[PDB]
Amino acid sequence: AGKRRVTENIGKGHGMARVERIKTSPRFAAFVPFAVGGRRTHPPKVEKIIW
Amino acid sequence: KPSYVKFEVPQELAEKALEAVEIARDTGRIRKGTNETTKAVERGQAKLVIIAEDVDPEEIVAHLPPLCEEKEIPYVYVPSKKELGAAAGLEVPAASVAIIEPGKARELVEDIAMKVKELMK
Amino acid sequence: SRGRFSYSFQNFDPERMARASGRDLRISPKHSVELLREIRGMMLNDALRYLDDVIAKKRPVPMKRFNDSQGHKPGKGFGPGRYPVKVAKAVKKILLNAKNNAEQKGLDVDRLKIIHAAAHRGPVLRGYIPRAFGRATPFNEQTTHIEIVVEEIR
Amino acid sequence: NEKARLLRIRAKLKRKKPRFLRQEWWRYPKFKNDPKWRRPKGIDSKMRLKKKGKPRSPSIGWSSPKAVRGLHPSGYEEVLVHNVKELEAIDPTRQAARIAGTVGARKREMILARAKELGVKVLN
Amino acid sequence: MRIINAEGLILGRLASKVAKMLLEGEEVVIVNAEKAIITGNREDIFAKYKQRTELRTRTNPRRGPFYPKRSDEIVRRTVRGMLPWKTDRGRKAFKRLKVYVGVPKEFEGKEFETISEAHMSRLATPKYVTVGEVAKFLGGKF
RNA sequence: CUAGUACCGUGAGGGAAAGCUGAAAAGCACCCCGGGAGGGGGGUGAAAAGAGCCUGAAACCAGGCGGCGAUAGGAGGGUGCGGCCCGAAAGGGUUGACCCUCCCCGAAGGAAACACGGGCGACCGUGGAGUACGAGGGGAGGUGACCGGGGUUGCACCGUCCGU
RNA sequence: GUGAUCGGGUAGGCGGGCGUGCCGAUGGGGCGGAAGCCGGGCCGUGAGGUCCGGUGGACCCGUCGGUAUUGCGGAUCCUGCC
């Protein structure tokens, strides 16, 4: 989850942050933890020991 | 039935005295406070006097009745400190009051007086 | 009726007053604000004469708040001024509606006075203009609400 | 008496005590509409350095005397009450009652009547 | 209003006293401003005041400085120097003062104070000049 | 939710946004103005909650009220003393607000007038006197209704933003 | 009880408290009006808590013990509005 989009960074020297964005309009940010719709940084995992 | 009381009032001259105080404050000059009415009836400035029925402790106005009795001043009862002080014109309660230069309510005031004479004797 | 909107006016008395509104108008809110300032406090007949003179361009309107690059005008107190014709027309229609409403209420149309005149910004209608180097930028219409209350003078 | 004296002390101290607010609470609406204290942590901060002309920071000296800490200005210890069964186990001599805000009118009336019987001061 | 005759008084000491009076709250009038004295050598004194007069903002001469050429205004300006001119208190104090050359008709035959701690018999050395001399060298109509 | 949909790319391929009337449509009959969208009176409903529909924050904008407002200098604040205005009673208060006078105890600290003397003098020593005062801790009588708070602002002293 | 021989603090170590969502228990509130929102009071060094009035129309809190996608001013941060 959050790991499905295909992204590209445009890099430096453009007045904007270096942030992975999708390639087709509307060119919204994707995949990274702090983006809306992105992967969640440290999510609950089924391998955790409860017993 | 508190202890330092000696009388009973019907609602009729109760509310009559209500209006009497209200319009006395409005028209002439009057005096609200336990020490105040003590001093009124001491110096002999007291035309009519009122005490409250919600007075804790019973030490605060116990003497007013006898000292008025002695100097021959009329003194009546009223139920609520709240209404008492309100008609006295205050955001606060009040325990005993006295009237002076009473205009516009001689009828009412000495009528209360005669009714309390009858209740007394 | 159909009170979709309300008024900023407080203390409305229906025995003495009448109301009128214009909603979602495609006019400038800045010019609306400047012009309603000038009629606040007048009698309706005088205000209608003033509006007709503005529409004919015989009397300018002072520009006290929104006045960038604006020329001055003949006479005393100028200073920057304009002639906003579209806004004056729309306001004329609002005022005539108010007069009708007062007269079907039963008030005297020669003793009416404007005691409330205010313009509010309405919703924006969004558009776009093509530019150079592959850009399209915004090209938008700003809308206006206007409300008026008149009172009868004893 | 000692308690009256310490209540006086508390009153004076808490009249002199300032309202403790973060560095620039007056400059941005994001801080005006939620006013709180936060510790300044910046290397170059004047309120951290405690320099003259700059607002003050909270410290353990501003605390009130233990005997009177947390008391109502009347002088009583408050107890929240949600029903009449909580009224008893109040000591009318040093405790007073505050009725909870979510209690309905039906019970407000009952609680006030029972408090009048027992002689318990109700602060609201 | 206290009226002070400046005849034979040392300018700076006079000004110090007057500034203190104006700050304490009194109205003051100085007469015979041209007859106050300045001690020292004429060349150094005149050079100082001429240098004062040739000071101006290079980009706009309507922004000053505006150091004086007349005698009454020299005296006024010295007093101003001894006050807190940048505050409202100082501005009000400075408005409570007036200085005059000679004695105008309105003050004739009246009580003229004198400030004892300013007086030139106090002096020993005779190297001194007069404020009127300075004004004349600078080009003032008195 | 009419989503691998609309849409973009010659093509492999890339890829959104978008939930809530009310118990019931009972979803505004009728009159005046307006070219019209609509406005105003009237109606339904417990409530307009009116489909531009539960609640309806902030930023932003308009008007009304209050205070300031055209001789004036500092990162927009801090301390202290004042002016104009507003009040709830959840804080207090006639079961006594504020203020005025008198009696008692009083830490560290600590006067002056005055009598004599020393010093060229600025001053000092002795006694007055550890007195009169003095943070504060108690008492007694005169008075009779505000106080605390809040908004804005004047005067004086202080103050070169935040993160790195 | 003792402290003339305790009272500044960056990196950094240690101690105690405030706040948020769900569970096992326990005590409770709510159409005689819950949560949320606006404006004001009191307590608290403080993080914060609680009351009054208004708006709203259906759920919520305290204590004991557990659990966690648990606290933002900043990333030429992300989305939306101005």
PDB file of N, CA and C in Angstrom, chain C residues 28-108:
ATOM      1  N   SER C  28     -18.082  44.730 -10.477  1.00  0.00           N
ATOM      2  CA  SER C  28     -16.912  44.900  -9.627  1.00  0.00           C
ATOM      3  C   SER C  28     -17.289  45.206  -8.180  1.00  0.00           C
ATOM      4  N   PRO C  29     -16.814  44.417  -7.213  1.00  0.00           N
ATOM      5  CA  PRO C  29     -17.099  44.731  -5.809  1.00  0.00           C
ATOM      6  C   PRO C  29     -16.377  45.964  -5.294  1.00  0.00           C
ATOM      7  N   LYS C  30     -15.222  46.315  -5.856  1.00  0.00           N
ATOM      8  CA  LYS C  30     -14.510  47.517  -5.439  1.00  0.00           C
ATOM      9  C   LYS C  30     -15.286  48.781  -5.798  1.00  0.00           C
ATOM     10  N   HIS C  31     -15.780  48.854  -7.034  1.00  0.00           N
ATOM     11  CA  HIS C  31     -16.603  49.982  -7.445  1.00  0.00           C
ATOM     12  C   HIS C  31     -17.938  49.990  -6.713  1.00  0.00           C
ATOM     13  N   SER C  32     -18.519  48.816  -6.464  1.00  0.00           N
ATOM     14  CA  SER C  32     -19.727  48.760  -5.645  1.00  0.00           C
ATOM     15  C   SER C  32     -19.499  49.389  -4.275  1.00  0.00           C
ATOM     16  N   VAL C  33     -18.392  49.037  -3.629  1.00  0.00           N
ATOM     17  CA  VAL C  33     -18.089  49.552  -2.301  1.00  0.00           C
ATOM     18  C   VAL C  33     -17.955  51.078  -2.332  1.00  0.00           C
ATOM     19  N   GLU C  34     -17.136  51.587  -3.264  1.00  0.00           N
ATOM     20  CA  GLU C  34     -16.946  53.030  -3.393  1.00  0.00           C
ATOM     21  C   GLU C  34     -18.260  53.770  -3.648  1.00  0.00           C
ATOM     22  N   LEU C  35     -19.139  53.225  -4.493  1.00  0.00           N
ATOM     23  CA  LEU C  35     -20.361  53.943  -4.834  1.00  0.00           C
ATOM     24  C   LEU C  35     -21.416  53.869  -3.734  1.00  0.00           C
ATOM     25  N   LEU C  36     -21.534  52.743  -3.032  1.00  0.00           N
ATOM     26  CA  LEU C  36     -22.534  52.678  -1.977  1.00  0.00           C
ATOM     27  C   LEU C  36     -22.165  53.567  -0.802  1.00  0.00           C
ATOM     28  N   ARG C  37     -20.866  53.731  -0.535  1.00  0.00           N
ATOM     29  CA  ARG C  37     -20.456  54.723   0.451  1.00  0.00           C
ATOM     30  C   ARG C  37     -21.104  56.081   0.204  1.00  0.00           C
ATOM     31  N   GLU C  38     -21.222  56.487  -1.057  1.00  0.00           N
ATOM     32  CA  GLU C  38     -21.705  57.827  -1.362  1.00  0.00           C
ATOM     33  C   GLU C  38     -23.207  57.978  -1.167  1.00  0.00           C
ATOM     34  N   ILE C  39     -23.995  56.917  -1.370  1.00  0.00           N
ATOM     35  CA  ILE C  39     -25.435  57.029  -1.171  1.00  0.00           C
ATOM     36  C   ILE C  39     -25.888  56.670   0.234  1.00  0.00           C
ATOM     37  N   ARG C  40     -25.024  56.091   1.059  1.00  0.00           N
ATOM     38  CA  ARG C  40     -25.393  55.846   2.444  1.00  0.00           C
ATOM     39  C   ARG C  40     -25.830  57.141   3.121  1.00  0.00           C
ATOM     40  N   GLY C  41     -27.096  57.193   3.526  1.00  0.00           N
ATOM     41  CA  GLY C  41     -27.641  58.310   4.263  1.00  0.00           C
ATOM     42  C   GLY C  41     -28.563  59.235   3.498  1.00  0.00           C
ATOM     43  N   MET C  42     -28.781  59.005   2.213  1.00  0.00           N
ATOM     44  CA  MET C  42     -29.558  59.909   1.380  1.00  0.00           C
ATOM     45  C   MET C  42     -31.029  59.514   1.342  1.00  0.00           C
ATOM     46  N   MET C  43     -31.830  60.416   0.788  1.00  0.00           N
ATOM     47  CA  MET C  43     -33.191  60.099   0.398  1.00  0.00           C
ATOM     48  C   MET C  43     -33.218  59.512  -1.008  1.00  0.00           C
ATOM     49  N   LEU C  44     -34.114  58.544  -1.198  1.00  0.00           N
ATOM     50  CA  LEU C  44     -34.134  57.747  -2.421  1.00  0.00           C
ATOM     51  C   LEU C  44     -34.221  58.600  -3.680  1.00  0.00           C
ATOM     52  N   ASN C  45     -35.054  59.636  -3.670  1.00  0.00           N
ATOM     53  CA  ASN C  45     -35.153  60.519  -4.828  1.00  0.00           C
ATOM     54  C   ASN C  45     -33.804  61.152  -5.167  1.00  0.00           C
ATOM     55  N   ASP C  46     -33.100  61.643  -4.149  1.00  0.00           N
ATOM     56  CA  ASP C  46     -31.792  62.245  -4.377  1.00  0.00           C
ATOM     57  C   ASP C  46     -30.792  61.212  -4.876  1.00  0.00           C
ATOM     58  N   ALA C  47     -30.864  59.992  -4.345  1.00  0.00           N
ATOM     59  CA  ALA C  47     -29.944  58.941  -4.756  1.00  0.00           C
ATOM     60  C   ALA C  47     -30.183  58.529  -6.201  1.00  0.00           C
ATOM     61  N   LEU C  48     -31.442  58.468  -6.615  1.00  0.00           N
ATOM     62  CA  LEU C  48     -31.762  58.154  -7.999  1.00  0.00           C
ATOM     63  C   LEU C  48     -31.275  59.244  -8.946  1.00  0.00           C
ATOM     64  N   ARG C  49     -31.410  60.513  -8.549  1.00  0.00           N
ATOM     65  CA  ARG C  49     -30.843  61.582  -9.367  1.00  0.00           C
ATOM     66  C   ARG C  49     -29.326  61.453  -9.474  1.00  0.00           C
ATOM     67  N   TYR C  50     -28.662  61.188  -8.349  1.00  0.00           N
ATOM     68  CA  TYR C  50     -27.215  61.010  -8.340  1.00  0.00           C
ATOM     69  C   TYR C  50     -26.790  59.890  -9.284  1.00  0.00           C
ATOM     70  N   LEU C  51     -27.481  58.755  -9.215  1.00  0.00           N
ATOM     71  CA  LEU C  51     -27.150  57.619 -10.062  1.00  0.00           C
ATOM     72  C   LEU C  51     -27.345  57.939 -11.536  1.00  0.00           C
ATOM     73  N   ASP C  52     -28.415  58.654 -11.880  1.00  0.00           N
ATOM     74  CA  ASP C  52     -28.592  59.055 -13.272  1.00  0.00           C
ATOM     75  C   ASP C  52     -27.480  59.991 -13.746  1.00  0.00           C
ATOM     76  N   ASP C  53     -27.052  60.930 -12.899  1.00  0.00           N
ATOM     77  CA  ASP C  53     -25.954  61.814 -13.283  1.00  0.00           C
ATOM     78  C   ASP C  53     -24.658  61.032 -13.491  1.00  0.00           C
ATOM     79  N   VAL C  54     -24.388  60.052 -12.629  1.00  0.00           N
ATOM     80  CA  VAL C  54     -23.212  59.203 -12.812  1.00  0.00           C
ATOM     81  C   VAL C  54     -23.297  58.465 -14.137  1.00  0.00           C
ATOM     82  N   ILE C  55     -24.433  57.820 -14.392  1.00  0.00           N
ATOM     83  CA  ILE C  55     -24.603  57.063 -15.625  1.00  0.00           C
ATOM     84  C   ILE C  55     -24.376  57.956 -16.838  1.00  0.00           C
ATOM     85  N   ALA C  56     -24.841  59.198 -16.775  1.00  0.00           N
ATOM     86  CA  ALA C  56     -24.619  60.135 -17.871  1.00  0.00           C
ATOM     87  C   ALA C  56     -23.219  60.737 -17.886  1.00  0.00           C
ATOM     88  N   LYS C  57     -22.414  60.506 -16.851  1.00  0.00           N
ATOM     89  CA  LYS C  57     -21.047  61.024 -16.760  1.00  0.00           C
ATOM     90  C   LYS C  57     -21.031  62.537 -16.576  1.00  0.00           C
ATOM     91  N   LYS C  58     -21.918  63.033 -15.721  1.00  0.00           N
ATOM     92  CA  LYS C  58     -21.951  64.434 -15.347  1.00  0.00           C
ATOM     93  C   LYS C  58     -21.451  64.678 -13.934  1.00  0.00           C
ATOM     94  N   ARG C  59     -21.230  63.631 -13.157  1.00  0.00           N
ATOM     95  CA  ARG C  59     -20.766  63.760 -11.787  1.00  0.00           C
ATOM     96  C   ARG C  59     -19.859  62.584 -11.435  1.00  0.00           C
ATOM     97  N   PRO C  60     -18.611  62.818 -11.043  1.00  0.00           N
ATOM     98  CA  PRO C  60     -17.731  61.704 -10.691  1.00  0.00           C
ATOM     99  C   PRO C  60     -17.919  61.219  -9.263  1.00  0.00           C
ATOM    100  N   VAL C  61     -17.443  60.006  -9.049  1.00  0.00           N
ATOM    101  CA  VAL C  61     -17.493  59.318  -7.766  1.00  0.00           C
ATOM    102  C   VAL C  61     -16.085  59.313  -7.195  1.00  0.00           C
ATOM    103  N   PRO C  62     -15.889  59.740  -5.951  1.00  0.00           N
ATOM    104  CA  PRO C  62     -14.542  59.744  -5.379  1.00  0.00           C
ATOM    105  C   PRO C  62     -14.036  58.340  -5.088  1.00  0.00           C
ATOM    106  N   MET C  63     -12.736  58.156  -5.281  1.00  0.00           N
ATOM    107  CA  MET C  63     -12.065  56.877  -5.078  1.00  0.00           C
ATOM    108  C   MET C  63     -11.091  57.054  -3.921  1.00  0.00           C
ATOM    109  N   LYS C  64     -11.502  56.611  -2.742  1.00  0.00           N
ATOM    110  CA  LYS C  64     -10.750  56.828  -1.519  1.00  0.00           C
ATOM    111  C   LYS C  64      -9.947  55.621  -1.065  1.00  0.00           C
ATOM    112  N   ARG C  65     -10.361  54.408  -1.415  1.00  0.00           N
ATOM    113  CA  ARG C  65      -9.652  53.201  -1.022  1.00  0.00           C
ATOM    114  C   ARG C  65      -8.936  52.512  -2.174  1.00  0.00           C
ATOM    115  N   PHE C  66      -9.561  52.396  -3.344  1.00  0.00           N
ATOM    116  CA  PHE C  66      -9.034  51.629  -4.477  1.00  0.00           C
ATOM    117  C   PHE C  66      -8.759  52.590  -5.632  1.00  0.00           C
ATOM    118  N   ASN C  67      -7.550  53.161  -5.681  1.00  0.00           N
ATOM    119  CA  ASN C  67      -7.326  54.345  -6.503  1.00  0.00           C
ATOM    120  C   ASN C  67      -5.989  54.347  -7.246  1.00  0.00           C
ATOM    121  N   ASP C  68      -5.416  53.184  -7.524  1.00  0.00           N
ATOM    122  CA  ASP C  68      -4.097  53.125  -8.139  1.00  0.00           C
ATOM    123  C   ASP C  68      -4.102  53.670  -9.564  1.00  0.00           C
ATOM    124  N   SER C  69      -3.140  54.549  -9.852  1.00  0.00           N
ATOM    125  CA  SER C  69      -2.894  55.148 -11.159  1.00  0.00           C
ATOM    126  C   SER C  69      -4.028  56.044 -11.644  1.00  0.00           C
ATOM    127  N   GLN C  70      -4.911  56.487 -10.759  1.00  0.00           N
ATOM    128  CA  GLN C  70      -6.138  57.162 -11.151  1.00  0.00           C
ATOM    129  C   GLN C  70      -5.968  58.676 -11.198  1.00  0.00           C
ATOM    130  N   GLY C  71      -6.444  59.275 -12.282  1.00  0.00           N
ATOM    131  CA  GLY C  71      -6.440  60.712 -12.416  1.00  0.00           C
ATOM    132  C   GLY C  71      -7.454  61.428 -11.550  1.00  0.00           C
ATOM    133  N   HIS C  72      -7.181  62.710 -11.384  1.00  0.00           N
ATOM    134  CA  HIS C  72      -8.014  63.669 -10.686  1.00  0.00           C
ATOM    135  C   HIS C  72      -9.021  64.308 -11.641  1.00  0.00           C
ATOM    136  N   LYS C  73      -9.996  64.991 -11.068  1.00  0.00           N
ATOM    137  CA  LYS C  73     -11.153  65.484 -11.792  1.00  0.00           C
ATOM    138  C   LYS C  73     -11.401  66.947 -11.470  1.00  0.00           C
ATOM    139  N   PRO C  74     -12.181  67.641 -12.296  1.00  0.00           N
ATOM    140  CA  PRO C  74     -12.434  69.063 -12.045  1.00  0.00           C
ATOM    141  C   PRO C  74     -13.177  69.302 -10.744  1.00  0.00           C
ATOM    142  N   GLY C  75     -12.795  70.372 -10.069  1.00  0.00           N
ATOM    143  CA  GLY C  75     -13.545  70.888  -8.948  1.00  0.00           C
ATOM    144  C   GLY C  75     -12.951  70.564  -7.595  1.00  0.00           C
ATOM    145  N   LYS C  76     -13.757  70.887  -6.595  1.00  0.00           N
ATOM    146  CA  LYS C  76     -13.346  70.877  -5.204  1.00  0.00           C
ATOM    147  C   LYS C  76     -13.515  69.483  -4.614  1.00  0.00           C
ATOM    148  N   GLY C  77     -12.455  68.971  -4.000  1.00  0.00           N
ATOM    149  CA  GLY C  77     -12.453  67.636  -3.445  1.00  0.00           C
ATOM    150  C   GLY C  77     -11.954  66.539  -4.357  1.00  0.00           C
ATOM    151  N   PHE C  78     -11.253  66.873  -5.436  1.00  0.00           N
ATOM    152  CA  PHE C  78     -10.733  65.886  -6.367  1.00  0.00           C
ATOM    153  C   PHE C  78      -9.296  66.271  -6.694  1.00  0.00           C
ATOM    154  N   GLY C  79      -8.339  65.398  -6.394  1.00  0.00           N
ATOM    155  CA  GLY C  79      -8.552  64.039  -5.939  1.00  0.00           C
ATOM    156  C   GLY C  79      -9.057  63.056  -6.974  1.00  0.00           C
ATOM    157  N   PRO C  80      -8.855  61.766  -6.718  1.00  0.00           N
ATOM    158  CA  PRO C  80      -9.244  60.737  -7.693  1.00  0.00           C
ATOM    159  C   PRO C  80     -10.735  60.420  -7.738  1.00  0.00           C
ATOM    160  N   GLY C  81     -11.237  60.229  -8.962  1.00  0.00           N
ATOM    161  CA  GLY C  81     -12.619  59.869  -9.205  1.00  0.00           C
ATOM    162  C   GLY C  81     -12.830  59.089 -10.487  1.00  0.00           C
ATOM    163  N   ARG C  82     -14.018  58.484 -10.588  1.00  0.00           N
ATOM    164  CA  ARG C  82     -14.413  57.655 -11.726  1.00  0.00           C
ATOM    165  C   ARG C  82     -15.879  57.881 -12.081  1.00  0.00           C
ATOM    166  N   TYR C  83     -16.337  57.159 -13.109  1.00  0.00           N
ATOM    167  CA  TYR C  83     -17.745  57.099 -13.506  1.00  0.00           C
ATOM    168  C   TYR C  83     -18.171  55.644 -13.709  1.00  0.00           C
ATOM    169  N   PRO C  84     -18.531  54.918 -12.628  1.00  0.00           N
ATOM    170  CA  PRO C  84     -18.966  53.521 -12.805  1.00  0.00           C
ATOM    171  C   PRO C  84     -20.427  53.296 -13.197  1.00  0.00           C
ATOM    172  N   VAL C  85     -20.606  53.045 -14.490  1.00  0.00           N
ATOM    173  CA  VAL C  85     -21.908  53.106 -15.145  1.00  0.00           C
ATOM    174  C   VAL C  85     -22.684  51.806 -14.945  1.00  0.00           C
ATOM    175  N   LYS C  86     -22.010  50.673 -15.123  1.00  0.00           N
ATOM    176  CA  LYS C  86     -22.629  49.365 -14.948  1.00  0.00           C
ATOM    177  C   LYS C  86     -23.150  49.178 -13.527  1.00  0.00           C
ATOM    178  N   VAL C  87     -22.274  49.411 -12.557  1.00  0.00           N
ATOM    179  CA  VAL C  87     -22.620  49.351 -11.145  1.00  0.00           C
ATOM    180  C   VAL C  87     -23.755  50.317 -10.818  1.00  0.00           C
ATOM    181  N   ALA C  88     -23.703  51.543 -11.349  1.00  0.00           N
ATOM    182  CA  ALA C  88     -24.779  52.491 -11.081  1.00  0.00           C
ATOM    183  C   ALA C  88     -26.122  51.986 -11.601  1.00  0.00           C
ATOM    184  N   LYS C  89     -26.132  51.356 -12.774  1.00  0.00           N
ATOM    185  CA  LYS C  89     -27.364  50.778 -13.315  1.00  0.00           C
ATOM    186  C   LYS C  89     -27.932  49.682 -12.411  1.00  0.00           C
ATOM    187  N   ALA C  90     -27.095  48.714 -12.044  1.00  0.00           N
ATOM    188  CA  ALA C  90     -27.564  47.633 -11.181  1.00  0.00           C
ATOM    189  C   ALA C  90     -28.111  48.160  -9.852  1.00  0.00           C
ATOM    190  N   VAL C  91     -27.419  49.126  -9.247  1.00  0.00           N
ATOM    191  CA  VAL C  91     -27.896  49.710  -7.998  1.00  0.00           C
ATOM    192  C   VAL C  91     -29.237  50.410  -8.201  1.00  0.00           C
ATOM    193  N   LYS C  92     -29.429  51.051  -9.356  1.00  0.00           N
ATOM    194  CA  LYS C  92     -30.708  51.692  -9.633  1.00  0.00           C
ATOM    195  C   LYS C  92     -31.840  50.677  -9.600  1.00  0.00           C
ATOM    196  N   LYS C  93     -31.604  49.496 -10.172  1.00  0.00           N
ATOM    197  CA  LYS C  93     -32.629  48.457 -10.135  1.00  0.00           C
ATOM    198  C   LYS C  93     -32.932  48.011  -8.703  1.00  0.00           C
ATOM    199  N   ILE C  94     -31.894  47.814  -7.885  1.00  0.00           N
ATOM    200  CA  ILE C  94     -32.121  47.437  -6.485  1.00  0.00           C
ATOM    201  C   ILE C  94     -32.988  48.479  -5.777  1.00  0.00           C
ATOM    202  N   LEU C  95     -32.663  49.758  -5.965  1.00  0.00           N
ATOM    203  CA  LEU C  95     -33.402  50.819  -5.291  1.00  0.00           C
ATOM    204  C   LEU C  95     -34.868  50.850  -5.710  1.00  0.00           C
ATOM    205  N   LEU C  96     -35.144  50.673  -7.001  1.00  0.00           N
ATOM    206  CA  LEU C  96     -36.535  50.645  -7.444  1.00  0.00           C
ATOM    207  C   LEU C  96     -37.303  49.477  -6.829  1.00  0.00           C
ATOM    208  N   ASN C  97     -36.661  48.314  -6.712  1.00  0.00           N
ATOM    209  CA  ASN C  97     -37.299  47.195  -6.025  1.00  0.00           C
ATOM    210  C   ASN C  97     -37.655  47.565  -4.587  1.00  0.00           C
ATOM    211  N   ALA C  98     -36.724  48.203  -3.881  1.00  0.00           N
ATOM    212  CA  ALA C  98     -36.987  48.605  -2.503  1.00  0.00           C
ATOM    213  C   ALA C  98     -38.161  49.574  -2.413  1.00  0.00           C
ATOM    214  N   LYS C  99     -38.249  50.515  -3.351  1.00  0.00           N
ATOM    215  CA  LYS C  99     -39.363  51.456  -3.348  1.00  0.00           C
ATOM    216  C   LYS C  99     -40.688  50.727  -3.512  1.00  0.00           C
ATOM    217  N   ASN C 100     -40.741  49.782  -4.448  1.00  0.00           N
ATOM    218  CA  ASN C 100     -41.946  48.980  -4.606  1.00  0.00           C
ATOM    219  C   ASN C 100     -42.328  48.290  -3.304  1.00  0.00           C
ATOM    220  N   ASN C 101     -41.348  47.687  -2.637  1.00  0.00           N
ATOM    221  CA  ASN C 101     -41.656  46.900  -1.452  1.00  0.00           C
ATOM    222  C   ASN C 101     -42.171  47.786  -0.325  1.00  0.00           C
ATOM    223  N   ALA C 102     -41.574  48.961  -0.165  1.00  0.00           N
ATOM    224  CA  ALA C 102     -42.069  49.906   0.826  1.00  0.00           C
ATOM    225  C   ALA C 102     -43.489  50.353   0.516  1.00  0.00           C
ATOM    226  N   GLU C 103     -43.802  50.580  -0.756  1.00  0.00           N
ATOM    227  CA  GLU C 103     -45.119  51.109  -1.072  1.00  0.00           C
ATOM    228  C   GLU C 103     -46.207  50.048  -0.964  1.00  0.00           C
ATOM    229  N   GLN C 104     -45.896  48.781  -1.242  1.00  0.00           N
ATOM    230  CA  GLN C 104     -46.874  47.739  -0.947  1.00  0.00           C
ATOM    231  C   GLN C 104     -46.952  47.449   0.543  1.00  0.00           C
ATOM    232  N   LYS C 105     -45.962  47.892   1.316  1.00  0.00           N
ATOM    233  CA  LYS C 105     -46.101  47.851   2.766  1.00  0.00           C
ATOM    234  C   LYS C 105     -47.025  48.958   3.267  1.00  0.00           C
ATOM    235  N   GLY C 106     -46.885  50.168   2.731  1.00  0.00           N
ATOM    236  CA  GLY C 106     -47.787  51.261   3.035  1.00  0.00           C
ATOM    237  C   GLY C 106     -47.120  52.538   3.491  1.00  0.00           C
ATOM    238  N   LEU C 107     -45.843  52.682   3.176  1.00  0.00           N
ATOM    239  CA  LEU C 107     -45.043  53.799   3.630  1.00  0.00           C
ATOM    240  C   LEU C 107     -45.060  54.898   2.567  1.00  0.00           C
ATOM    241  N   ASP C 108     -44.628  56.095   2.955  1.00  0.00           N
ATOM    242  CA  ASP C 108     -44.611  57.241   2.053  1.00  0.00           C
ATOM    243  C   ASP C 108     -43.294  57.277   1.284  1.00  0.00           C
TER     244      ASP C 108
END
